[PDB]
Each structure stands twice: as structure tokens, then as C-alpha cells.
Amino acid sequence: MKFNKNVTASRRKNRKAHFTSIGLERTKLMNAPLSKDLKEEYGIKRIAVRPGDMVKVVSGEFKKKEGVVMKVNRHDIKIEVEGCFVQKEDGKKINKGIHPSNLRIIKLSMEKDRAEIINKKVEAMKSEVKA
Amino acid sequence: SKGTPSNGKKNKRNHTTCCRCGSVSFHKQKGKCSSCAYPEKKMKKMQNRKAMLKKTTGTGKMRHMKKERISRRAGYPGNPILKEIRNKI
Amino acid sequence: GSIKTRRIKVQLVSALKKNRCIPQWKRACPGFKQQYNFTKRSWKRKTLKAC
Amino acid sequence: MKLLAKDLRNNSIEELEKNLVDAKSEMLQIRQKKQSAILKPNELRNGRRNVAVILTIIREKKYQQLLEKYKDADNIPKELKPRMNRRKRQELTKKQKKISKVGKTKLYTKGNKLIYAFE
Amino acid sequence: PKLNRHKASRLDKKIKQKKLIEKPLGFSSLDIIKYGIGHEGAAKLIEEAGTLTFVVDQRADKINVKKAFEEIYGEKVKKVNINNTMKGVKKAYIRLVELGNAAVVATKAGIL
RNA sequence: GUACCGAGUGAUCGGUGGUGGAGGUAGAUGCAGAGCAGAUCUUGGUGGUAGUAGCGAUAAUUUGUCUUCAGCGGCAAAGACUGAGGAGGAGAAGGGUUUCUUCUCAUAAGAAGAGUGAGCCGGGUCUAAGCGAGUGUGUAGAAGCAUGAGCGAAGGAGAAACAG
RNA sequence: AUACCACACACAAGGGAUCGUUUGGCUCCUGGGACGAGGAAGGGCGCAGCAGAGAGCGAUAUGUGUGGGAGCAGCAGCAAUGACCACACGUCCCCGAAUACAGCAUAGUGCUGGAGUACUCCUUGGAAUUAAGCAUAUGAGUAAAGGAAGGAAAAGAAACUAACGAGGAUUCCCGUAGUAGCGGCGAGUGAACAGGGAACAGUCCAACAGUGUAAUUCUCAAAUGAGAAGUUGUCAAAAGGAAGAAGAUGUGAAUCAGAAAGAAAAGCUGAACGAUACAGGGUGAUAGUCCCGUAGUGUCUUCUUACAUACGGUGAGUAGCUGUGCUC
Numbered sequence: 006m007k008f009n010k011n012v013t014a015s016r017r018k019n020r021k022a023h024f025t026s027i028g029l030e031r032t033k034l035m036n037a038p039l040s041k042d043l044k045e046e047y048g049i050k051r052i053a054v055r056p057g058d059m060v061k062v063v064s065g066e067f068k069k070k071e072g073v074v075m076k077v078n079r080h081d082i083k084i085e086v087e088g089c090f091v092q093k094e095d096g097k098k099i100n101k102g103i104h105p106s107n108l109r110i111i112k113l114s115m116e117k118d119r120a121e122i123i124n125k126k127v128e129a130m131k132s133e134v135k136a
Numbered sequence: 137s138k139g140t141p142s143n144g145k146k147n148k149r150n151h152t153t154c155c156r157c158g159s160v161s162f163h164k165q166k167g168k169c170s171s172c173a174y175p176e177k178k179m180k181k182m183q184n185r186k187a188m189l190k191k192t193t194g195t196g197k198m199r200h201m202k203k204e205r206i207s208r209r210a211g212y213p214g215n216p217i218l219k220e221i222r223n224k225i
Numbered sequence: 226g227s228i229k230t231r232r233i234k235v236q237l238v239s240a241l242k243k244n245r246c247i248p249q250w251k252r253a254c255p256g257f258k259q260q261y262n263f264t265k266r267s268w269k270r271k272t273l274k275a276c
Numbered sequence: 277m278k279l280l281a282k283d284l285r286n287n288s289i290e291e292l293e294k295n296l297v298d299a300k301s302e303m304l305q306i307r308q309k310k311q312s313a314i315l316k317p318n319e320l321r322n323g324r325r326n327v328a329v330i331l332t333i334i335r336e337k338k339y340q341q342l343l344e345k346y347k348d349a350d351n352i353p354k355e356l357k358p359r360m361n362r363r364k365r366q367e368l369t370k371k372q373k374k375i376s377k378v379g380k381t382k383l384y385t386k387g388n389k390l391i392y393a394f395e
Numbered sequence: 396p397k398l399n400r401h402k403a404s405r406l407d408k409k410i411k412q413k414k415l416i417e418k419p420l421g422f423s424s425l426d427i428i429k430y431g432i433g434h435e436g437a438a439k440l441i442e443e444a445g446t447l448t449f450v451v452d453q454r455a456d457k458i459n460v461k462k463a464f465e466e467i468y469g470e471k472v473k474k475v476n477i478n479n480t481m482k483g484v485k486k487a488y489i490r491l492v493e494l495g496n497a498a499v500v501a502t503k504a505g506i507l
Numbered sequence: 508g509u510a511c512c513g514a515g516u517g518a519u520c521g522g523u524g525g526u527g528g529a530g531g532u533a534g535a536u537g538c539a540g541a542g543c544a545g546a547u548c549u550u551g552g553u554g555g556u557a558g559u560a561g562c563g564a565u566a567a568u569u570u571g572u573c574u575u576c577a578g579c580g581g582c583a584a585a586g587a588c589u590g591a592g593g594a595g596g597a598g599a600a601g602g603g604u605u606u607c608u609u610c611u612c613a614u615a616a617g618a619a620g621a622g623u624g625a626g627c628c629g630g631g632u633c634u635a636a637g638c639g640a641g642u643g644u645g646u647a648g649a650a651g652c653a654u655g656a657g658c659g660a661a662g663g664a665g666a667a668a669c670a671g
Numbered sequence: 672a673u674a675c676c677a678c679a680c681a682c683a684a685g686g687g688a689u690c691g692u693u694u695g696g697c698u699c700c701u702g703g704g705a706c707g708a709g710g711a712a713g714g715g716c717g718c719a720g721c722a723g724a725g726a727g728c729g730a731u732a733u734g735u736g737u738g739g740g741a742g743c744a745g746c747a748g749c750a751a752u753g754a755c756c757a758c759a760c761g762u763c764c765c766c767g768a769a770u771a772c773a774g775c776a777u778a779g780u781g782c783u784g785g786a787g788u789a790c791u792c793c794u795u796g797g798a799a800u801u802a803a804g805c806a807u808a809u810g811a812g813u814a815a816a817g818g819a820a821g822g823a824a825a826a827g828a829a830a831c832u833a834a835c836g837a838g839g840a841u842u843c844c845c846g847u848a849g850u851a852g853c854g855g856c857g858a859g860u861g862a863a864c865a866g867g868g869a870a871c872a873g874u875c876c877a878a879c880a881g882u883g884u885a886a887u888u889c890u891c892a893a894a895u896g897a898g899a900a901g902u903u904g905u906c907a908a909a910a911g912g913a914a915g916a917a918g919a920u921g922u923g924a925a926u927c928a929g930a931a932a933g934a935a936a937a938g939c940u941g942a943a944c945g946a947u948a949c950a951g952g953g954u955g956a957u958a959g960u961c962c963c964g965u966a967g968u969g970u971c972u973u974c975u976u977a978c979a980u981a982c983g984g985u986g987a988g989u990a991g992c993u994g995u996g997c998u999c
């Protein structure tokens with residue numbers, strides 16, 4: 006049960022809040038679980054998927070496959086994974102997008118600011134965990 | 137006759153664009169606008185509630201009024217270079 | 226006619242720049258849902274009231 | 277070349293005015309390479325950012341020049357005080373609101389009370 | 396006195412105040428000129444009549460245009476004519492005190 | 508939703524086979540914006556009449572030839588007509604790109620470009636009949652009345668250009 | 672009836688009912704009640720690499736600073752030398768109260784004007800309608816038109832009720848009451864005190880200011896002087912505080928596998944695990960354990976509020992009266 010009356014439980018309101026999200030709230034939509042080993046290598050339980058990271062598909066047509074993330078579509082919430090595609094009548098191949106939550110991370114791309122992003126989150130935990 | 141043949145003579149134009157309201161209703165001979173009463177200081181009485189709500193505050197852009205509300209929320213902080221003047225006052 | 230005031234001329238200039246179809250590249254954009262520009266006009270079918 | 281704010285803040289008003297004529301000359305040259313010939317889409321963006329930065333840094337330096345002048349004076353020019361709104365500028369100060377005596381109580385003040393219980 | 400001003404040629408009316416800070420350089424040569432026009436229509440005018448054609452800011456007048464050219468490009472000017480076009484652009488035509496110099500200035504400036 | 512078949516005096520109810528692609532009832536009670544053939548009813552969609560009634564006042568049209576791809580479209584040669592108070596050549600009021608080039612039929616249709624240069628031409632000046640801010644008096648506020656800055660003619664007055 | 676006209680059934684046309692769905696509406700409750708001469712509200716015109724409308728912004732038309740951090744939806748180009756977002760600031764074209772103006776106050780600085788007006792206060796003031804007709808009356812001191820202010824506004828501490836063994840400012844709720852009465856005594860209209868509660872608070876001016884000296888307010892100087900207002904009368908004292916409330920934001924448990932079948936399992940079947948969290952939303956069919964939250968817990972920022980002097984019993988074109996008009 007919910008006892009805070011400032012938070013809404015309306016279906017109409019929850020749905021609008023989802024689809025009209027922007028900025029950091031949009032980034033929260035692209036989160037995926039880490040594998041059991043990585044959850045010992047790092048403190049975090051889940052992270053936003055980025056290009057170059059390595060993922061196992063755990064639901065759908067392409068179940069059991071593994072591959073590298075090629076692109077991240079923020080407007081239509083989908084991820085393109087290397088080697089997951091369909092062939093047209095022409096023989097031409099189109100990558101099919103997968104929803105973030107159907108993936109699981111196997112190796113992290115550590116290019117750019119990723120190491121600082123991870124550090125910032127670990128500290129935020131401990132700050133309140135140790136109190 | 138009063139129908140089609142009299143329509144041919146209708147080539148003069150009594151109203152032009154008003155400079156206060158835009159509404160092509162300034163009568164040149166009378167020296168008055170039929171939408172907004174220019175050049176009188178106050179705006180005209182609008183005929184009914186339906187017609188007046190079409191020209192109220194919030195039907196356009198409200199540029200100044202919006203900024204004022206944001207500044208009031210922030211506590212009227214002013215330009216940060218000049219904080220010392222603010223603080224003294 | 227040939228004699229015009231400055232106020233009448235600016236109204237004609239603005240009424241002439243607005244009278245154009247949707248550019249052909251916009252139709253390819255993922256989020257774009259318009260078919261035809263409903264604000265297009267013809268001199269044979271409407272008056273500007275520039276007077 | 278993309279000018280940076282912290283690396284301009286070191287110049288005098290006399291030096292910054294020199295820089296402005298160059299940026300404006302460069303903008304003219306850009307417009308010609310658009311009517312005539314062909315332009316990379318990035319060029320007009322970069323041209324226009326450079327003028328805006330110089331005008332922003334000049335304005336700050338002139339405000340400081342005015343601050344040093346009037347800081348300690350009576351009759352500060354209005355523009356140096358924050359705008360607020362017309363009614364907040366005309367309000368009475370909190371001292372002035374409390375000097376009046378026009379219907380104030382004799383007894384029944386906050387000061388005439390004791391800390392007591394009831395049983 | 397208040398009047399609707401529908402027959403007037405100047406759309407501005409109000410007299411302008413002073414200000415505590417004033418804008419750095421003011422209405423000045425590099426605001427006045429926009430670009431020179433180089434196409435088959437303009438090319439003939441350089442070759443036959445020693446005149447260049449330019450787009451200029453709406454706020455500009457004959458005297459200002461004369462000064463701005465002599466400042467940016469450097470040749471001396473005989474005449475300036477002006478034309479408000481149906482596309483909302485003010486065009487200026489500038490004739491130089493010596494012909495032949497028109498082809499020199501046009502080529503240096505990359506108009507032609 | 509659509510064909511069949513069964514149950515009920517009847518309002519209605521049940522099953523079977525194709526179509527459809529994600530929700531739905533049976534019993535007992537509660538609240539109602541709770542059942543249509545009609546109102547010269549309201550809104551939207553479709554017939555018969557019917558390949559029918561009509562589409563042709565005015566000067567009039569023929570032949571060859573090229574395109575067009577099937578335009579009495581263009582060009583040559585004939586035959587006519589308006590007949591200088593013209594079906595000719597120009598301005599104003601009104602319209603506003605309808606003007607020029609290219610392409611396409613989508614055609615009294617579109618799309619993309621280009622085009623209007625003044626000391627001497629007209630406006631910005633003067634004043635007609637007249638209108639009027641402010642001030643005075645009046646009114647709950649107005650209207651009205653006295654005086655009066657400013658305004659009032661692209662065909663009245665009004666410095667100076669013509670050929671190629 | 673060979674071929675026309677009608678009806679039934681199957682297939683193809685023609686139209687958009689029905690069923691399934693919804694980032695919209697409506698109603699009730701709670702907060703808020705924030706404009707303008709420092710140029711508003713409202714109108715116009717410009718600004719994109721390819722850009723008509725709409726959105727955003729002013730010739731600085733995606734600038735500066737802080738907190739974050741990954742892409743910019745098409746095509747070409749950009750981006751850890753910061754893509755994009757959030758908070759504040761800087762810049763902010765022309766018309767418009769539109770003002771180089773009008774009226775007005777001070778020793779001086781100045782103030783007003785226009786916008787909005789659901790709710791509150793002050794004026795002015797109908798007719799349709801009901802009376803089974805209609806003229807007094809009704810609808811109604813309502814509609815319409817004008818003036819003015821605030822987050823509420825108005826009212827308010829008895830020249831008050833009552834006749835009890837009396838009460839004790841104003842406003843609001845239950846009630847006296849469809850009563851006492853008003854009325855072609857027709858149609859119809861119509862209050863007050865009590866008794867039970869919410870919330871509670873009282874005070875100022877004049878009459879009436881030290882005369883062994885206006886002791887009072889303001890300006891410039893100066894470290895103690897000049898000047899303005901005022902004798903048609905100026906001047907009657909305290910800092911000070913912790914509480915109370917509203918927002919913003921951090922953290923936050925626990926799952927795997929399978930026959931058949933499907934485009935896809937979260938369904939179904941077996942085995943587990945969390946709960947101070949089984950509110951609700953998203954994921955390719957119906958998910959406590961896949962994602963965002965929720966229960967529980969931390970931080971921070973704003974706002975509101977608080978001690979001093981002297982007094983009484985005569986406030987006039989008023990109360991009242993005569994005539995007159997409206998009103999209850």
C-alpha cells in the first residue's frame with residue numbers, strides 16, 4: 006500500500022509521465038541488469054546500456070545470442086545488437102531493435118566517462134549504507 | 137435594380153488596418169476603430185462574454201509576466217556581479 | 226494598382242512568402258505526420274483584405 | 277578558431293573592441309562564401325558564436341566599472357538595483373509598518389503571560 | 396496628437412531615450428553591407444557600366460552605403476541607387492568613379 | 508460479424524462451420540443519460556427518374572504541314588469580321604505575382620528559379636467645406652455646449668528634362 | 672421473357688455501423704491568487720545548412736555561470752577542447768497607456784494614467800414573465816451600463832437588545848419560521864431576540880503638551896556653525912526569538928528451468944526466494960522477484976511570528992420638524 010498522497014496512482018497520469026519523459030528521466034529507461042560476476046567486480050546492480058558493450062539476449066526471437074551494442078534509439082526505446090537482423094525480399098538486411106529490459110550485460114564498454122559514472126554511484130550508496 | 141446590377145458599383149473601401157489591434161476595422165472618415173475604439177485611451181466594451189475571452193491575457197505570449205513569476209520563485213536574486221548593492225539594500 | 230502605401234506593400238510581401246508547400250525532405254522524417262499545408266491559398270479563391 | 281571566455285577576461289575594454297572588428301570582418305567573409313560558392317554547415321554557427329561571446333564579456337566589464345563608481349554613494353542609478361516588481365518597490369519597510377499606534381493593545385501583549393498548567 | 400498613420404512612409408514614430416550603457420560600435424559599416432550578388436544578370440553590369448550590386452540592411456540609406464563601401468573595399472563612388480524588392484530585400488547599386496576598377500574589386504572580393 | 512440448425516405463446520436465448528485477433532460471462536443484489544418506423548425530426552451515406560433533359564445569342568471557316576501523341580496546339584496559304592463613340596493603344600479605383608524562363612501533366616494545374624534602380628514624375632507641403640486633443644462648464648459616469656494645438660485634396664494651388 | 676423487372680444464396684464492388692482501445696474532456700476537493708512609465712496586456716515583422724504552418728527566441732535571434740553527463744529522429748556534417756537537459760542571469764526590433772504629454776504634491780526625490788474584474792464594495796436601473804384579461808403588485812433592486820480595491824473584500828467593539836432571577840463587539844453554521852406581518856388582504860411576498868455551536872482582542876484622534884525659554888522635523892557643513900518648515904501650534908519611547916509550516920532531493924529486498932504449442936511466454940508445469948515494500952505504470956499474450964517506483968529511511972533550502980510614557984464626559988447647517996420622491 007501507498008500512504009503518500011502527493012504521488013499519483015492514475016493510469017492516465019502514469020502513462021503520460023512515461024512517454025513524455027526527457028533528460029535524465031529518459032536515461033533511466035535504458036537500464037539493464039548486470040551478470041552475477043560483474044555484480045562482484047563492481048558495486049552496481051544495473052546500468053544504462055551504451056555502444057560497444059556486450060550483451061546476452063534473454064527473451065524473444067534472438068534468445069541465447071550474444072553481441073556488441075551498435076546503436077541506442079532514445080525516441081523509440083530500442084537497442085540494436087550486432088547480428089540480430091531480418092532479410093527483405095531484396096536480400097537486404099535490417100537490424101531489429103530490442104527493448105532494454107530483455108538484455109543482460111556480459112562485458113562493459115569503459116570508453117570515456119564510464120569509470121567516473123560508476124564511481125559516483127558507488128559513493129552515493131556507501132554515504133547512506135554506513136550511516 | 138437593387139440586386140446584381142448594383143453590385144458593380146461597389147469599388148470604394150471604408151475600413152483599413154488599425155495600428156493598435158490589427159483587425160482591418162479603422163473607419164477612415166469617422167476617425168475611429170470599430171474593434172477597439174482607437175484613438176480613445178481605453179479599449180472598447182466587448183459585446184458578450186464569448187467574444188471577450190478571445191482577446192484576454194493568456195491568448196498571446198505573456199512574455200514579461202512569465203519571467204516575473206520565475207524571478208519571484210527564485211527570490212528576486214538579480215545579476216550576480218552586483219550582489220553587494222542588493223545586500224546593502 | 227501601381228500606387229501603394231508602405232503599409233500595404235509589407236502586407237503583400239509577407240502574404241507571398243507564406244504561400245508555399247511542405248518541403249520534400251520533411252516527409253521522410255520519422256516523427257512528421259502532416260500531409261498537405263492547409264494554409265496555402267489561390268488568388269482566384271480568396272481575398273487578402275489588404276484593400 | 278573557437279574563442280573561450282576565461283581566456284578573454286584578461287583583456288582591457290580597448291583590446292576587446294579590436295577583436296570585435298575582426299570577428300565582424302570574418303562574418304562578412306562567411307556570408308559571401310554562402311551566396312557564392314559552397315560552405316560547410318558548421319561555419320555559420322562558429323562565426324556567430326564568436327561575436328556573442330565578445331559582446332557578453334564587454335557588458336560584464338562595464339557593469340564592474342559602474343559598480344566601483346557608485347558602490348558607496350547615495351542615489352545609486354536605478355538599473356544597478358534588482359528589478360523585482362512595481363509593488364515590491366513601493367512597499368513600506370518593516371520598521372515603518374510597526375511605528376503606528378492606531379489600534380494597538382494595552383494589556384493582551386505577548387509579554388504579559390506566565391507558564392502555567394491546569395489540573 | 397494621435398492619428399492612425401496609415402498614409403505614412405516611415406513606420407517608426409517614437410523619439411529614443413539615452414541609456415546607462417550603450418552598444419559597442421553602433422550602426423556601422425559591417426552591419427550595413429550583407430553580400431555582393433554575382434550571377435548572369437549582375438555580370439553584364441560589371442562588364443558594361445562599371446557598377447556592382449549588393450544586399451544591404453533594411454535600416455540603411457544612400458549616405459551610409461556610400462561610406463561603408465569606401466571603408467570595406469576602398470574604391471571611390473560616383474552614385475548609389477536603391478530598390479525595395481518583392482522578396483523583402485533592399486538592393487543597392489553602386490557606380491565607381493573609374494570603370495575597370497569594378498572587375499578588380501569584384502574578383503578580389505570573390506563576388507564574380 | 509455472417510450463413511445454417513434447435514429451444515420459448517412471445518419479448519428473446521443456445522449451439523455448429525467459415526472470418527476475426529484480444530478479451531468475456533452465469534447467479535443474487537445497487538445506481539440509471541436504460542429498448543424507436545413516423546416528429547415538412549438531426550447528422551452522414553445511397554437510389555429510381557437517366558446514358559435521359561440539356562451543353563450551340565455574337566464575326567465563319569477551309570486546305571496543307573509539323574509536332575502532339577493525338578490539343579481546329581504551332582506555322583504557311585486563302586476566306587471573313589470589329590470599322591478610329593473599335594472586339595485598337597494607354598492611365599485611375601479594385602485585384603496581388605496572375606508578368607518572364609525551364610520542366611511536368613496535374614493543365615483557367617502544379618513545381619523550381621528570376622524580375623520593379625529618380626534633385627527635375629507622384630507622395631511627404633498649403634489651405635476648402637469640415638473634424639478635433641487639451642482646457643472651461645456640465646454629468647454618478649457619459650452625452651451636450653464655449654474656445655482651440657493638431658488634422659483635412661495621388662484629378663484645386665504647388666522650384667527645375669528632353670531626344671536616341 | 673433468350674436479354675426486362677423482382678426475390679434468395681455464393682463471389683467481387685460501395686460505404687463506414689458494431690465490437691475491442693484512448694498522452695482528451697467533465698465534476699468534486701486542496702493549494703495559489705504572483706502585471707505596467709525599470710514601457711504592460713494585445714498586435715506586427717524578422718531569426719534554421721537544406722524550413723511552409725505551428726513551437727522557441729530578438730540583429731548577442733542556442734551567450735555566461737552552476738549541477739549533471741552521450742548523443743544530435745531524415746540527408747550531409749558536428750561532439751569528453753562536452754551531444755543534450757535542468758536551474759538562474761545577461762541580451763530583449765517596430766506599433767501600443769504611448770508620453771519631448773496631461774493633472775498634481777514635497778526642502779527634495781516623485782505619484783497617477785492602461786490591463787484584469789470569478790469573488791467583495793459604491794452608483795444607475797429594464798422588459799419578457801405570473802396574476803388564466805389588465806393598469807397597483809410580481810419577476811427585481813435582478814439583467815444591462817458606469818466607478819474602485821485586495822488576496823480575500825465588506826463589517827466590527829452598543830446614542831444595542833430585553834422586561835428574565837436577564838444578557839453583553841463583528842462575521843459564519845443549526846434554529847426561531849414559510850412564523851409576526853406586508854398585499855387589487857388577490858396572485859404572491861416575508862424579518863428579529865432567544866436556545867445549541869465555530870472563532871475570539873480590543874484600541875486611537877479632537878475637546879486637553881514642559882513657558883526658568885519649540886524641548887519638534889528636515890538640509891548643508893562641521894566636530895560645532897549656517898539655513899528651510901513651524902506659535903493660524905510641532906512634539907506622548909525598546910531591542911529581542913526559538914518554534915511552527917511548506918517544498919526540493921538521496922537511498923531502498925527478492926528467479927530459474929521445461930514437454931506440447933505460438934511470430935513472440937510473463938501464460939501453463941515443477942522447483943525455489945522477498946515482504947514495515949502484493950499502490951500503480953512499462954516490457955512481442957495475464958510478472959511480488961526483467962525495468963521505473965512503493966513501504967521504510969536520510970539530507971538540504973525557503974517562509975511566518977515576538978517587551979515602555981500624558982488624559983475624558985458638549986465632535987452642528989448636525990440631530991429633529993414641515994412638505995416631497997424612492998425604499999423596507
Ligand SMILES: [Zn+2]
Pocket residue numbers: 154155156157158159161169170171172173174
Ligand atoms: Zn483597433
